[PDB]
Each structure stands twice: as structure tokens, then as C-alpha cells.
């Protein structure tokens, strides 16, 4: 569907919000997110703290004002027209039924169904400390995957930060970790049919056929250059370097 | 070891000065001769420090504090005087980038030695705690100081300083590692 | 007079759905509000009020903190008319509301229509009343109930909130007949008289 | 004289992201931070003046908007000192404007001191950052001293930049690049489809080389160059093609 761009600026700021707000896990610092949502890839330009109150002692009890967004967008629009409201964020890390109320408030203010944003203010788990949800509805809400863009100007300052293969595997466990547990969770949580829906694609393995072995067929030619890869290495430098040395070492006139 | 005080006398505090920093200048300037021998005047000036320690945020004073906060540990260096540490520790904590800096030195100078890990904690705390470039900076130097020949000892704070996000701790870490391992090469170091 | 923040609690509910005097209760609520709020902003300019939904199956703010018409603006649109008590929650929201009340030295105030049969528990009710008095909220209530809503929480509550009256709570329980709310409460120290504490 | 400017890169990127579109005009607006003793210039935040169709101008600064935000920001808990000026000066090592100075200058009145932060949104793009801060006048100096008391101070006069963030965002920032498992091996298992081309690629890699090698017998299409380069890329994918099984 509309799965979205992610703005580090947002992400950072939202955490400084979290920081600034002195928010603890008792709370989730919330606020507007900005972008333009029309495309099958929504973009997140920006995002804004909505000064807020959250109480899960009584869930539906919590406080927020729109008049921010009122005053906000005006300036924001005046700042940039592309800022048009795409949705909103919060801290998280995880959902609370208070959300849905919060959710639909923005539906007043959004073109499409507005966007939740989970953050992990502790940035703990994985790729993203983040989720973004959109109500669907029997309610639905849903996370489409998202990611960062360039934002190179960001990436440039980002370049001032940091400083091939393996990781690709490294999630090998993750879902599989919780997964069977997740079963045994629900298994011994209730001790749904979706799970059985998950099931049949398990057989989708031990599948391997001679069809497999055709791999090496391919893998054969794959290796042809392995010499040639280094054959030119196998050729040039120290030939010439010796020459160059023979030049240089014989240079040595006076 | 006599004249220098009288040398500083016209520029000593109470002899006034044209500049309070000129006036502050003698303070540090004094111990230059008297290092280790000026403790009295030092502590005396430290009294003037202690006098203005818990107060007197005049830059002019802060210099008069700092320049004194300078020369204090200067003569107090290697001599363990908690007051030197302490009196500075306020002047330190008084958070004058002017003044509090010298504290981050003299306190190191006082306990220069194996010192005490508490000041280290303090310093290292004040490091992460206190918000300043310099005031935060000179701490590790003081940390570098009172970790002296301790070698294996400071490795924690070293490691801590090493593990620091901030240059400053890493920075002084080497100096710490130095005063620990200076002279004899510790290869690993 | 008043420098304090207020909240308007509207139930649009089994009573508000149903005209208690023209044109509906829920409508009778309306201009009484502005009437009130006028005198509220006449109490002082900067006197702020909230507006929430105690109505329907969803509690929520309708008009947030402000100080002029933007409420009268906000209140302009409807509600669930037959809706049901969020009061406790709504109040507990109205409390948290006032916890964010703008440019404090504004004391906390709340004004509450009762358009609902009023289902809640006394302790919770008084925990509110406590929490209010704790938070130090001014609490005055608009109630015309069946019978009325009274000999009940609402009666304990205004008491239970209240060590000092208008620093905590005053009550009026709205009567039937050609009783114009704004005309009625013109009497009660929900408005006028002494206005804040 | 040697002075310390500090940014939360948020405010940086905010400027940037705002300055990145800023062209033609400089992006303008508040800068949020403080002064810790001397030397210490922090920026926690910053934000746009809403565009001035007249362009960057001292009039264009609106203190309502700030108040608006700063309120909502104070509402956010967001609060700082307005620490100076920041703008986007495309293609400009330059200097900003005597105006821009006068802009800051009439403004830095509002402070003990302020900044006018140059950004070349153009040449910031290098992957390094182009950026600067003027504030042209001194006490004496780090204490420069003469040109003020002797009057007529007109110069570039930068301040000295820095900034600080955290390892916190840093990790999350390094988190840029369900996810990878969905995203990698296994999403790019897409490899065997084109083996015929993966041959043919390699098969075309072939011819290019004797040709290239031939020249071994300056100016170029070098006999030795592409040869390796040509194939070598394939290898990694050519390699990993296996892995998923």
C-alpha cells in the first residue's frame, strides 16, 4: 500500500522529545509526524511533539490538545507547503488501547487514514526502534514496513557519525526464536486459526531435489574467473615493480 | 624564596592591580617560585580562595579565584591536602570555566600520586556531570594526575576514560596512562 | 474574579438526547455554556475552560484549552446524542486536562452537565473528589437527572471534593420545568456570586 | 576568540533539511541553545522562519511564530535561548550580508552574543558539511581587541564550530543502513533467474579482455585494467548465490 519513508530528523527529535519530556515507560511521548502521504510510498518529512498526558491507570484517561497542530500546521504550512499532515507519532515502544482514540482524532486532520508511529526510545531491538501503524478495521491497524531515505544532507552530518554479507544471515534466529515460543505462548497463553494459516506454508525444508544440485552447475562457471580475478594480479605489479625496481635499483648512477 | 612574594607584592591581591587578572596573575605567579614551599601563602591564598570559594562569580574575582585556583595546587602539588582538593572542589563545582578549570588541575596536583578513587569518581562524575568544555576537560587531567604510577590501578578509569564518548576522558586517559606508566614502557599500554 | 482554568463536561446522553427545556437538553446545554463561559471570560479574560465528551461510547476532548470563542466554535458540532457516561473517565480526563491547563496560577475548575444516568462507584467518585481536591480543582456540576442524579455520587462528590467550597467544589442539580439552565445556574455559585478559589 | 559552537545534529539536519530546500533564499529562524560561561555555544534546536517571499530580511523575522512555537515548545518542554542566526548560502564561502550581520547585529543585541550560521546548502552536500557562524565584534578577544576600540570592524569573522549528540541516536543512526531476514538473503535470493546472463555477463567479461590484454604490446583503454575489475564485482553475488540452501 502506502508504506512509508522514515526521517531520522524525526526519529532523533522524537527521542529528544522523549528526553526533553522526561518521559518514562509510564508514558509515551507523542506527537505529529509530517510528510506527504498520497503515494504508495508515503514520505515522512518531519514530526512534532504534541504536548500530552498519558495515564494507563485509567487507560482512556490521558490528555492531548489539537490546538498545537492548529497553530503548528499554520507555521508549518507557512514554513513549507509540503508539510501536509500525514499522521502522527508517539514513543511506544508498544501499543495501548488509548491509541485508537488518539488515532482517530488525527483522522479529522489527515487525508488518508493517518499514521501511528511507534518508537523505541531505548532503541533496543533491531532494524528500526520503530513501528508505524495505520488503523484499518472488528478494528484493524497495520504496520507497513518503512525505511530511511536521503536525507543525504542528513546522511552528511550522519557521515560524521559511524566511524557485504554476514549480517544478512544474522536474523536467522529472530522470528524463529519467538515463533515456536509464540506458539507455545498462545499455546499456553490460552493454555488462533491464523497460526494454522501460518502452518501450511511451513511445508513451503526437506524439499531438496536433484534440482538443488543444479546449483553447483551454476556455481561451476561462477568460479571461472577466480583465477582471472587474480590472474592480472598474477601478472602485472611485481613484474613492473621489479622492472620499476630494476629501474629504481639500477638507477643509482652517481 | 623570599623576594618573589615581595616581587609579587605590588601585584599581589590587596596591593590592588590595574587588572584583576594581573591581580589574579600574581596568585598563580606566586607559587611558581614557591611550589611546594608556598603552602602557607597558598593555603593563605586558598583562604582567599576559600573566602571567595563559595561566592564571588566576578570574572575578575573568578580570575582572582582562578589565578589563585591556579597557584594553589601549584605549590600544593604532590602534597595531599583535602582542602586543596576540597576548596577547589567547590571552586570546581562553582562552575567558572575561568576558575573551575584550575580546580580540575590543582585537585589533581594535590593528590597527584595514587590519589583517591573518590575524587576520581567525583572528577569522572563531574566530568560527565559538570557541563563545560574546559571544566569538564581538565578533570581527566586531574584524573591523569592522581593516577600516577598507579599503572594497573587506573585501568578501570582508563578503560572508563577509554570507553568515554567524550574525547576528554579518552584524552586524559592517555595522560592518565602516562602518569601511571610513564617512564617504563607498558607495551600493552 | 476568576483566574483559573475550567473544563466543560458535556454528556450528550439519555438526557441531552432528550429536550429538558428548549430546544433540547443538549441544546439547552449549549447557549447556557456560552452564557456561562461569557461570564467566565467576563470573570476575567484569560479564564480558560475545557470541553470534552462525557457522552457516547468515546470519552474525548471536544474543545481544548482556550479563552474566547474557539470553544463556541468547537462546541458548535453535535456529539453522540443518546450517549453514555464517561464521567469518571471524562472527569479524570478533565482532571489531567487541567493538569495541562495553560499558564498556571490558573486554578483548576470543571463544569459538568449530567445528561447520563450516572453509573460510577462511590469510592472512584470520591477518589476523583480526592484527586480533584488533591489536584485542587474547582468543581461545579450541571445535573438534571432522572429523579435527578442526586442522593447519589453527585451529592457526596461535591462534598467529598470539598474542604474549601470553590477551591474544590460547589453543586447545582438542575431542576425541571421552564427552568432555563443559564437562568437557573445564574443563581447557583456555579457562576457569578463568588466565582473562584 | 577561540569559541565553542555546539549543535544537536537534529537542529543541524533540521536546518539542512530545511536549508536543503532553502534555495534560493537563506532559511531563517531561531536557534535554540544557551551559553555556558564563555566559549560555550550550544544549539539544542532551531527552526524555520516561515518563508519571506521578499527573501531573507530583518523584517521577515517574526517573533510571534517563535512565541507560538516556543509556547508549544515550552508546551513540548522545548525551551532554550535564541542563540543566533542560521542561513543557507548556496555556493557561498563568502560572508552573509552586512544586512545579515545587521540582522544578527541588531539581534545579537537581544543576547550577550549570538551567531549567524552560514550554511552552503549547495556545498554542504559534499558529504562533509559546509557551515560557519559569524558574530563580528569581541570583548577584547579570548582576552579582536583593537579593531573594536579602534572601530570599523568589518570582516568575515567566523566563530568555531562543534556539536555533540550521543551514542544513543548514533546506534539508531547506525541503524539506518522482521527486516533483514525479510530483507536480505532471501530477498536477493533473486540470483539464479539470470544465471544465463550471469554466464553471459561472465561470458561477455571474456571477450573484453584478450582485447584489453592485447594492447600490452600514455593513452589507453589499458591492457590490464578492466580485466579484473570486469569480473571481480560479480564474485560476491556470484559467491553468495549458494548460501540460502
PDB file of C-alpha atoms in Angstrom, chain A residues 50-140:
ATOM      1  CA  UNK A  50       2.267  17.069  20.836  1.00  0.00           C
ATOM      2  CA  UNK A  51       2.442  18.124  24.479  1.00  0.00           C
ATOM      3  CA  UNK A  52       0.402  15.457  26.007  1.00  0.00           C
ATOM      4  CA  UNK A  53      -0.690  13.477  29.020  1.00  0.00           C
ATOM      5  CA  UNK A  54      -0.948   9.705  29.267  1.00  0.00           C
ATOM      6  CA  UNK A  55      -2.461   7.668  32.074  1.00  0.00           C
ATOM      7  CA  UNK A  56      -2.799   3.915  31.884  1.00  0.00           C
ATOM      8  CA  UNK A  57      -4.114   3.700  35.433  1.00  0.00           C
ATOM      9  CA  UNK A  58      -7.279   4.695  33.624  1.00  0.00           C
ATOM     10  CA  UNK A  59      -6.416   3.906  30.008  1.00  0.00           C
ATOM     11  CA  UNK A  60      -8.862   6.164  28.183  1.00  0.00           C
ATOM     12  CA  UNK A  61      -7.804   8.916  30.560  1.00  0.00           C
ATOM     13  CA  UNK A  62      -4.926  10.873  29.007  1.00  0.00           C
ATOM     14  CA  UNK A  63      -4.642  14.404  27.702  1.00  0.00           C
ATOM     15  CA  UNK A  64      -3.809  15.984  24.378  1.00  0.00           C
ATOM     16  CA  UNK A  65      -4.638  19.258  22.640  1.00  0.00           C
ATOM     17  CA  UNK A  66      -5.059  19.664  18.905  1.00  0.00           C
ATOM     18  CA  UNK A  67      -4.647  23.431  19.027  1.00  0.00           C
ATOM     19  CA  UNK A  68      -0.960  22.794  18.780  1.00  0.00           C
ATOM     20  CA  UNK A  69      -1.484  21.223  15.388  1.00  0.00           C
ATOM     21  CA  UNK A  70      -3.794  24.117  14.682  1.00  0.00           C
ATOM     22  CA  UNK A  71      -1.094  26.644  15.495  1.00  0.00           C
ATOM     23  CA  UNK A  72       1.566  24.183  14.381  1.00  0.00           C
ATOM     24  CA  UNK A  73       0.498  23.458  10.823  1.00  0.00           C
ATOM     25  CA  UNK A  74      -0.119  27.136  10.091  1.00  0.00           C
ATOM     26  CA  UNK A  75       3.504  27.933  10.720  1.00  0.00           C
ATOM     27  CA  UNK A  76       4.411  24.542   9.267  1.00  0.00           C
ATOM     28  CA  UNK A  77       2.472  25.292   6.117  1.00  0.00           C
ATOM     29  CA  UNK A  78       3.934  28.788   6.196  1.00  0.00           C
ATOM     30  CA  UNK A  79       7.253  27.037   6.754  1.00  0.00           C
ATOM     31  CA  UNK A  80       6.589  24.566   3.971  1.00  0.00           C
ATOM     32  CA  UNK A  81       3.557  23.593   1.953  1.00  0.00           C
ATOM     33  CA  UNK A  82       4.798  20.031   1.599  1.00  0.00           C
ATOM     34  CA  UNK A  83       4.385  19.578   5.368  1.00  0.00           C
ATOM     35  CA  UNK A  84       0.786  18.421   4.944  1.00  0.00           C
ATOM     36  CA  UNK A  85      -0.320  16.207   7.780  1.00  0.00           C
ATOM     37  CA  UNK A  86       0.401  12.549   7.129  1.00  0.00           C
ATOM     38  CA  UNK A  87      -0.133  11.166  10.577  1.00  0.00           C
ATOM     39  CA  UNK A  88       1.478  11.290  13.976  1.00  0.00           C
ATOM     40  CA  UNK A  89       3.999   9.642  16.241  1.00  0.00           C
ATOM     41  CA  UNK A  90       4.363   8.573  19.814  1.00  0.00           C
ATOM     42  CA  UNK A  91       7.082   6.980  21.872  1.00  0.00           C
ATOM     43  CA  UNK A  92       5.875   3.471  22.465  1.00  0.00           C
ATOM     44  CA  UNK A  93       7.658   1.052  22.446  1.00  0.00           C
ATOM     45  CA  UNK A  94       4.279  -0.638  22.312  1.00  0.00           C
ATOM     46  CA  UNK A  95       0.596  -0.040  21.838  1.00  0.00           C
ATOM     47  CA  UNK A  96      -2.149   0.882  24.257  1.00  0.00           C
ATOM     48  CA  UNK A  97      -5.878   0.958  23.620  1.00  0.00           C
ATOM     49  CA  UNK A  98      -5.628   4.696  24.367  1.00  0.00           C
ATOM     50  CA  UNK A  99      -4.032   4.803  20.920  1.00  0.00           C
ATOM     51  CA  UNK A 100      -7.185   4.171  18.915  1.00  0.00           C
ATOM     52  CA  UNK A 101      -8.884   7.194  20.458  1.00  0.00           C
ATOM     53  CA  UNK A 102      -5.721   9.170  19.781  1.00  0.00           C
ATOM     54  CA  UNK A 103      -5.653   7.506  16.366  1.00  0.00           C
ATOM     55  CA  UNK A 104      -8.958   8.703  15.052  1.00  0.00           C
ATOM     56  CA  UNK A 105      -8.511  12.241  16.316  1.00  0.00           C
ATOM     57  CA  UNK A 106      -5.956  12.699  13.556  1.00  0.00           C
ATOM     58  CA  UNK A 107      -8.347  11.155  11.060  1.00  0.00           C
ATOM     59  CA  UNK A 108     -10.058  14.503  11.373  1.00  0.00           C
ATOM     60  CA  UNK A 109      -6.790  16.120  10.366  1.00  0.00           C
ATOM     61  CA  UNK A 110      -5.436  13.633   7.828  1.00  0.00           C
ATOM     62  CA  UNK A 111      -6.033  12.985   4.154  1.00  0.00           C
ATOM     63  CA  UNK A 112      -5.865   9.213   4.262  1.00  0.00           C
ATOM     64  CA  UNK A 113      -6.086   7.206   7.425  1.00  0.00           C
ATOM     65  CA  UNK A 114      -3.351   8.891   9.495  1.00  0.00           C
ATOM     66  CA  UNK A 115      -0.251   7.117  10.675  1.00  0.00           C
ATOM     67  CA  UNK A 116       0.758   5.895  14.077  1.00  0.00           C
ATOM     68  CA  UNK A 117       4.439   5.825  14.847  1.00  0.00           C
ATOM     69  CA  UNK A 118       5.991   3.553  17.421  1.00  0.00           C
ATOM     70  CA  UNK A 119       9.462   4.443  18.563  1.00  0.00           C
ATOM     71  CA  UNK A 120      11.738   2.526  20.842  1.00  0.00           C
ATOM     72  CA  UNK A 121      13.036   5.393  22.914  1.00  0.00           C
ATOM     73  CA  UNK A 122      15.521   2.833  24.165  1.00  0.00           C
ATOM     74  CA  UNK A 123      16.301   1.849  20.571  1.00  0.00           C
ATOM     75  CA  UNK A 124      16.729  -1.677  21.851  1.00  0.00           C
ATOM     76  CA  UNK A 125      15.832  -4.442  19.483  1.00  0.00           C
ATOM     77  CA  UNK A 126      16.611  -4.271  15.789  1.00  0.00           C
ATOM     78  CA  UNK A 127      16.354  -2.515  12.469  1.00  0.00           C
ATOM     79  CA  UNK A 128      14.013   0.265  13.448  1.00  0.00           C
ATOM     80  CA  UNK A 129      13.455   1.014  17.029  1.00  0.00           C
ATOM     81  CA  UNK A 130      10.206   1.747  15.401  1.00  0.00           C
ATOM     82  CA  UNK A 131       6.821   0.802  14.115  1.00  0.00           C
ATOM     83  CA  UNK A 132       4.246   2.841  12.277  1.00  0.00           C
ATOM     84  CA  UNK A 133       0.629   1.805  12.349  1.00  0.00           C
ATOM     85  CA  UNK A 134      -2.412   2.812  10.404  1.00  0.00           C
ATOM     86  CA  UNK A 135      -5.906   1.940  11.538  1.00  0.00           C
ATOM     87  CA  UNK A 136      -7.843  -0.366   9.220  1.00  0.00           C
ATOM     88  CA  UNK A 137     -10.876  -2.036  10.796  1.00  0.00           C
ATOM     89  CA  UNK A 138     -13.530  -5.644  14.129  1.00  0.00           C
ATOM     90  CA  UNK A 139     -10.917  -2.894  14.050  1.00  0.00           C
ATOM     91  CA  UNK A 140      -7.714  -3.267  12.117  1.00  0.00           C
TER      92      UNK A 140
END
